[PDB]
Task: inverse folding
């Protein structure tokens, strides 16, 4: 054989992949995650899982054909979760998506029923994995993945408000003519209608914008900065109305989270975690707060100082999410 | 204003972009080209053009929302080609796209008609850009772009067989247990069914595979390596069958070409250019041969030494394209 | 003749680079800046200049020999400034360096004399460039370079406190178990002994550290955070004491600034610019304040809101610098 | 208190990196390896080891101070090898290096004595690591490390001719006006004066330069291409003459090998390995041949087909090295 004529093999055993990522779901979100992760060189193996065999195999093949231009030497796929074995991170993007005029919270029963199947099959093969939830309603579903998986809370993460804050900072940058990297600002709470812009923390170069205009973000704001948060809240729906779905932004957001996890960076991101104990919250609610994200998931939470109004709004977001948790049928 | 108490302005500027790229067509191919370019930090401004307003705006906004995660500070879109002004590189992906069970050659008149509108508009606003044609059939559409634009031929480049060679190197590498980067070999001619694998040149570490198996790539080949080229030819058809189109691999191939162009690398790529006065060809056929690709587009062609068979197959490819090309209305 | 047998030349070669960087000085700082810039793919051409013939040729060759692992297709050097033609960014690292126990301010007369030769030669061949001053004392020498060059002040930038701030942020993250990217804080003023830590802006996720502990940065501070600023002031001297010189940190800090310039990012950096008209300063003092940096250099300055303490300290740093700059002759 | 006021900790992690790299030796070569590995984001922890306490700590700090600009969240150093624990890859650059005019082979006993300390200490703290030997004479010291470590031969790799080949392709590219990524050719055998350029494999785009010029590489060659290989051989002596040592190219070359290892690429590199069973070699000789480099080190060897004279040159390199190798004391 030509291979043996050309190459002498010196070593048998192949070990476990060392930095494997899995993406569950090959819709537009799932594939945007995949291409983003491949192009950031975060994984030595990428596995894709879905339920539609042709579509899955075709996406797999299309990525494989780009391997020359990549540094991720094994791309594989299957309907069977055995393909996800020894993942360090499994990203769950599967489920129904919200339509125009439909709240993300309306997706809960459909996506809960899917997670009942996906979650036990995912965790079965990957003892070292972190679960990153992207499907919506992401907060509720992070809680659901946590209850179904039986994982510790540090390993179950929701993409949460990482994108909402990315949008906030993009919009802020456009208003100030500064790059989003140098515009700082946190959108916390539900990834959805009840998110909370933390005006008290919005700053360029450590300069609090609120200290320059104490009316910032209030109805009395002459420059109507609240509308930036409104744009944040409406963004998914505005993009859905225009092109049918969203994909690129969330892909890049999830790829940012994946980088912090895979590279043990311990950067702070506003992502879905349990907040029992903070502010007024006495229940097992998941929502976005600033979390330190590393190789073991969320190891620490930053305790953001909130004005009484900000805290009220965050507790309100938490009440909304808890109300839907009480609807969950396990 | 808030901005003005925060920031002391010292320069009005405006400022032209210095590394601008435009993508024409926000279909799946075009947006894959866009995401791969954004993720390779090739451009300081990306402009998108297409004719369906809402689709276009929504793709732009979706990309814009990921700006925090990118290093391309200006992303813009319009139907109006004034948005393309001062591009260094304009990538045209627009037009009818290959359908299931049909040759790329079946798209040719409709895409000629569309290029009759697109190219003068591109030329008008960026008269010194490089044009990179990706729309199918890419070899004829590169010839067409060149005739309509009036550009010298160095500045009119077709994505050609960069992808087919990438696929071939992937498949070869999968056979040999070696990364595609270390598996060398060229598919030339048509980006389509008459492509030519240059078996004479296929090698690993400088070791000609043909020197270990003289029958390599022929009917007489015990290991039927010819099937690897057959897989390259069929790839698009299979991927289209499975997922409806191809996007990721072409996006990555186009970004690779954009990289050589934008960074003046003078790497060699098998890409579409005028072959008049090669291999005994007296017409203005465009097809892939190995080209040195740089800031001034295609500056040089590597004269591949083809066997009589390979030369035969290459002239057959040229004849096939000339036979479609000569009967066009334009 | 081998080249011509291999390659058909299709296009006359005129040698115009589009993203050229020059580094003046091939000492340890200059070669650090060079390698860091080469590894961030910022330039399509790197020129080196110095006055020691052998050292210059050796350094160039050693870089050149790594070209396969890089994407900078041309690396050149000369004593003659014609080698720097058409640079978009010129980075000045040449001059005397501080011994152990010697202030950067003591370098001023020696480095002024050198800048009287270097700066007109650079400006001669690169009329579109930005000048990035790294030579010390950087703040006075940025002023000098500005006066000599006849360039507008936006185009003459000093590396200033970009490094002091990166140190502060590193030290802070090490104290908090957070990546420096997520620890925010500014060190402004002179790149040297009179630099000003802005405690009022020090924050993680927008949470002011000084609000948690109002004693922050004072002698009364039970955790002595003032020592962090001390370590920042002492850093260069401590590293010089230990290894003979500093190189890597400043090389990275200079590559950071070059990225913002070359990619027109408009990020905010604490870098040397004219501050006359802020904080009651009336003379042409240059020092670090947070600036927006892009393709035309410093376009905007952020007016940091300072405590009376911090402001007084900044006025004193200004006074120190004018104390040396007033007497300058050239 | 401040940390605890700011952050709620969720769990006590085992820090324990997944992608730790150790560089032994912080001379010019080691630190160039460190900076290149840092800039290629290959590791989550970098450990440095040397015997000069002050220099070691200086270099560590200088790297640490640039952390803001990197993605390697822990940089440590010690004279104690406990600091190197759980490294996936240990890169040994320590030892005497060539003075001007000095053969690499003259370093041999000094560096064998140093390896007798080093290798057992490395093995002790990372018994599953891959060793990458860079210290000279690299071929013999790869053997010595293999004997002393007791590791399987797959896990003990010498940088070998990776740099010699990179130089060759640089020089070739400069001759042809093509980027060295598109110029292919292999320098094999000893990393030094007896290395063997394999002219039969030298090609652009699969076009054999020797088939265009039958006299290529011969003293009869009109264009004296042999002087390209002479240039390769002389490069380190030339650069050492000019600047006192070599650093950047070897740094880049070692990082490229680290990348193949760490990301399991299974790229092909001409690197030092036990070649017993090839080319008549009956003894445990180490020298460079093209090897498939991955996460388990060298898993496979490509069998290059050498002309009778090429093979003879290589058996020369072999005999030279085994002469010294066979009489070593440890
Ligand atoms: C219990 C019964 C069903 S188990 C189940 N596993 C999966 C996995 C992936 C996806 N994929 C998507 O949801 C992608 C959506 C899109 O096409 O945009 C759906 C499901 S349903
Ligand atoms: C009468 C008007 C003719 S001018 C014209 N300009 C464009 C520009 C872009 C696209 N975009 C696509 O073809 C979509 C791509 C896909 O769906 O794959 C089509 C056209 S038609
Ligand atoms: C009196 C007239 C002489 S003009 C002159 N041009 C240069 C250029 C480079 C350097 N190089 C360094 O100073 C090394 C850099 C460092 O070690 O920081 C010195 C000079 S002196
Ligand atoms: C006999 C037993 C001694 S054990 C020993 N461990 C080390 C570790 C590092 C280095 N460092 C260099 O060789 C770098 C020097 C330079 O290039 O400047 C030398 C040694 S010697």
Result:
């Amino acid at each position: 054989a030509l291979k043996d004529q050309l190459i002498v093999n010196l070593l048998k055993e192949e070990q476990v992949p060392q930095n494997k990522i899995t993406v569950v779901g090959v819709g537009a979100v799932g594939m945007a995650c995949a291409i983003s992760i491949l192009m950031k060189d975060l994984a030595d193996e990428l596995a894709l899982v879905d339920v539609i065999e042709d579509k899955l195999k075709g996406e797999m093949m299309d990525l494989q054909h780009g391997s020359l231009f990549l540094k991720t030497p094994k791309i594989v796929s299957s309907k069977d979760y055995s393909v996800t074995a020894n993942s360090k991170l499994v990203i769950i993007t599967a489920g129904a998506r919200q339509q125009e005029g439909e709240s993300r919270l309306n997706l809960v029963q459909r996506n809960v029923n899917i997670f009942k199947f996906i979650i036990p099959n995912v965790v079965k093969y990957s003892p070292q994995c972190k679960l990153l939830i992207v499907s919506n309603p992401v907060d509720i579903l992070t809680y659901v993945a946590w209850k179904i998986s039986g994982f510790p809370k540090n390993r179950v993460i929701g993409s949460g408000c990482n994108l909402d804050s990315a949008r906030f900072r993009y919009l802020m940058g456009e208003r100030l003519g500064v790059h989003p990297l140098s515009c700082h600002g946190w959108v916390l709470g539900e990834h959805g209608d009840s998110s909370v812009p933390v005006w008290s923390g919005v700053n360029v170069a450590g300069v609090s914008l609120k200290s320059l205009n104490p009316q910032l973000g209030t109805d009395a704001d002459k420059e109507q900065w609240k509308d930036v948060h409104k744009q944040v809240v409406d963004s998914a729906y505005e993009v859905i109305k225009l092109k049918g779905y969203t994909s690129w932004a969330i892909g890049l957001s999830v790829a940012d989270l994946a980088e912090s996890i895979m590279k043990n960076l311990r950067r702070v991101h506003p992502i879905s975690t349990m907040i029992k104990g903070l502010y007024g919250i006495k229940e097992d609610v998941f929502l976005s707060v600033p979390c330190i994200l590393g190789q073991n998931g969320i190891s620490d939470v930053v305790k953001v100082t909130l004005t009484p109004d900000e805290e009220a709004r965050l507790k309100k977001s938490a009440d909304t999410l808890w109300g839907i948790q009480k609807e969950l049928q396990f």
Q: What stands out?
A: Residues C 24-25, 27, 29-30, 50-51, 93-95, 97, 113-114, 117-118 surround VAB (ligand 3) (CB under 6 Å). DSSP finds ten helices and 14 strands in chain A. The interface with chain D takes residues 5-11, 13-15, 17-19, 41, 44, 71, 73, 88, 152-154, 259, 263-266, 277-278, 292, 294-296, 298-303 of chain A (CB under 8 Å). The domain at 161-328 of chain A is CATH 3.90.110.10 (L-2-Hydroxyisocaproate Dehydrogenase; Chain A, domain 2).
